[PDB]
Amino acid sequence: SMVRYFYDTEFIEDGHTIELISIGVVAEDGREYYAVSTEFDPERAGSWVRTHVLPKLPPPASQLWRSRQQIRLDLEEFLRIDGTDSIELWAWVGAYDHVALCQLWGPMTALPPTVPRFTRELRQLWEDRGCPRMPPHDALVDARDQLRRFRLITS
Amino acid sequence: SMVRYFYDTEFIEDGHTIELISIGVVAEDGREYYAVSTEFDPERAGSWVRTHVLPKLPPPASQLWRSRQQIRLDLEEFLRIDGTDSIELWAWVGAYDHVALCQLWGPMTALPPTVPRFTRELRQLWEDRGCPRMPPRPRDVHDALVDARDQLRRFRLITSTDD
Numbered sequence: 001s002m003v004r005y006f007y008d009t010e011f012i013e014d015g016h017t018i019e020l021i022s023i024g025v026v027a028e029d030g031r032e033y034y035a036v037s038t039e040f041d042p043e044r045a046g047s048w049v050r051t052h053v054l055p056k057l058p059p060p061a062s063q064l065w066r067s068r069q070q071i072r073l074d075l076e077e078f079l080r081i082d083g084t085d086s087i088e089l090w091a092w093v094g095a096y097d098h099v100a101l102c103q104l105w106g107p108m109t110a111l112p113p114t115v116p117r118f119t120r121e122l123r124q125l126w127e128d129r130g131c132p133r134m135p136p137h138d139a140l141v142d143a144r145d146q147l148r149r150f151r152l153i154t155s
Numbered sequence: 156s157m158v159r160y161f162y163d164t165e166f167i168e169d170g171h172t173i174e175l176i177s178i179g180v181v182a183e184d185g186r187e188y189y190a191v192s193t194e195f196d197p198e199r200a201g202s203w204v205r206t207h208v209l210p211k212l213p214p215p216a217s218q219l220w221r222s223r224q225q226i227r228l229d230l231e232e233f234l235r236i237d238g239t240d241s242i243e244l245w246a247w248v249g250a251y252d253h254v255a256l257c258q259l260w261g262p263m264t265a266l267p268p269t270v271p272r273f274t275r276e277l278r279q280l281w282e283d284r285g286c287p288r289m290p291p292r293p294r295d296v297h298d299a300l301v302d303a304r305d306q307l308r309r310f311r312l313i314t315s316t317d318d
């Protein structure tokens with residue numbers, strides 16, 4: 001069968017690279033994943049990220065802080081890539097999010113075979129369904145909200 | 156009061172950067188844009204890009220070869236970023252193509268206000284309509300302008316449907 005995952009990332013981007021700060025992913029079965037990268041340089045954060053992203057992060061002793069390799073491994077387990085379920089990825093205005101996600105494996109040719117090479121655009125579905133009314137920058141909170149919006153849109 | 160632009164990019168992406176090779180854009184009113192960047196390093200190309208993308212590029216002397224700044228300016232004009240129509244960007248999937256297009260303006264904060272921050276995905280629209288049988292993929296698919304043209308043709312079939 002098919003399982004949908006809704007995700008969001010926070011990152012530092014400068015028109016050239018995208019340095020991942022955090023990633024939240026929620027499956028439609030209710031499972032949740034959240035991690036913060038130990039490998040981004042907070043000194044490179046612009047004012048917006050420094051004031052709206054970085055203060056919401058966990059304290060530094062939290063086990064939520066993980067290396068990029070750990071996050072990759074954690075996502076391979078979370079997405080159940082070794083099993084037979086098919087995977088759909090969804091994000092809201094997530095072009096950069098998709099890149100940040102794929103770059104945890106490398107070039108998009110390094111993606112595990114069962115992870116799709118594109119992320120469905122939740123904003124597109126929303127508009128396609130006539131922009132139904134939905135409810136009123138932490139990545140797991142945002143990912144959770146995307147799932148909630150999908151279920152409303154598709155109800 | 157809205158105009159749809161269908162686009163494709165070709166690039167060298169290595170898990171860190173996305174270095175633009177070319178971009179093709181087709182407006183649903185028939186207008187076309189195509190340019191090839193003078194700034195990507197062809198030696199950095201992988202074997203797949205070397206065989207499928209590079210040989211379809213135009214000769215060095217072609218006026219199609221342009222700087223990144225020039226492509227930006229050209230796109231500001233072509234998309235009519237200061238016009239009254241709203242702009243819709245469409246591509247087969249967006250993601251890497253959307254980042255490659257938008258990095259023409261540098262960081263996300265510098266994208267002109269009227270350019271949308273997402274690209275509508277034809278692949279998603281095609282699936283949402285029940286995966287209708289489509290025409291075959293054309294002769295030179297990894298020529299960015301050929302790709303964009305074909306995307307518009309598909310969009311029209313997917314939406315000029317009986318539903």
Ligand SMILES: [Mg+2]
Binds near residue numbers: 009
């Ligand atoms: Mg986001």
Ligand SMILES: [Mg+2]
Binds near residue numbers: 163165166
């Ligand atoms: Mg492309």
